[PDB]
Design a protein around this ligand. Structure first.
Ligand SMILES: O=C(O)c1ccc(C(=O)NCCO)cc1
Length: 257
């Protein structure tokens, strides 16, 4: 596997706030951005091991970059190019949010500071609440995406039988804004039964768990991005079987992958 980056993983390594790769960040202004409201690109400086996969993360309704900013460097420090985006308007709906995620990804293909650091064939999308519903719409409109992770996602669309991208559904047990029963779990159930997928429910968590550094959210999101954006079979140990975490209230997967 030529896409493997960094040393072999442990529980502490996937839990670390910053991984091995030192990270730097560049900004894309609202004017510089074609198809989204701008954002911050986090990237590893060490290029000696090769290019990295790309990840785009979207915020929720009326939210901006800082609700998801802590995910940028945390994920990128494991060996990824991560752009956290602002939406074009504060009221953009989940279908629009999936486009701004794809436009942010495409913008990485031609970004000057990053395009030499990116493998444009291995990209993933992420999002909180409506940004999570957008992450599903971006996968449902681009079967070449390698991973999708809606974090407490929200969407009026319940049937996702057209997603072909390995998807990690992260719901919050005590979510009232987007309850897992009618949202997150409904998304996992309508995904293809043969798709490499997994539903993870965070114990005692509200809708706001992703707006602040949550280690459980970070560790499994890293494992998913490794196993699927890098095809890194070293990270399957953390997904198959069910993780032993009190932080996880429920878990269902298509393991082994
Ligand atoms: O971001 C929020 O504060 C928010 C956005 C949308 C709703 C809503 O109307 N969803 C009903 C469908 O379950 C609620 C809260």
């Amino acid at each position: 596997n030529p896409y493997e980056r960094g040393p072999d993983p442990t529980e502490s390594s996937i839990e670390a706030v910053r991984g091995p790769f030192a990270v730097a960040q560049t900004t894309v202004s609202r004017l510089q951005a074609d198809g989204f409201g701008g954002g911050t690109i986090y990237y590893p400086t060490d290029t000696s091991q090769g290019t990295f996969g790309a990840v785009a993360i979207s915020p929720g309704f009326t939210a901006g970059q800082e609700s998801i900013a802590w995910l940028g460097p945390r994920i990128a420090s494991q060996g990824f190019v991560v752009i956290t985006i602002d939406t074009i308007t504060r009221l953009d709906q989940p279908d629009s949010r999936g486009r701004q995620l794809q436009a942010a990804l495409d913008h990485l293909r031609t970004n000057s500071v990053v395009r030499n650091r990116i493998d444009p064939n291995r990209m993933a999308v992420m999002g909180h609440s409506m940004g999570g519903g957008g992450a599903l719409s971006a996968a449902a409109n681009n079967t070449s995406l390698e991973a999708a992770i809606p974090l407490q996602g929200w969407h009026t669309r319940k049937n996702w039988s057209s997603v072909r991208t390995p998807t990690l559904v992260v719901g919050a047990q005590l979510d009232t804004i987007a309850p897992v029963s009618s949202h997150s779990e409904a998304f996992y159930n309508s995904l293809p039964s043969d798709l490499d997928k997994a539903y993870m429910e965070l114990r005692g968590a509200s809708h706001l768990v992703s707006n602040t550094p949550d280690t459980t959210t970070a560790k499994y999101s890293i494992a998913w991005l490794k196993r699927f954006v890098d095809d890194d079979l070293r990270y399957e140990q953390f997904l198959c079987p069910a993780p032993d975490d009190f932080a996880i209230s429920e878990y269902r997967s298509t393991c082994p992958f």
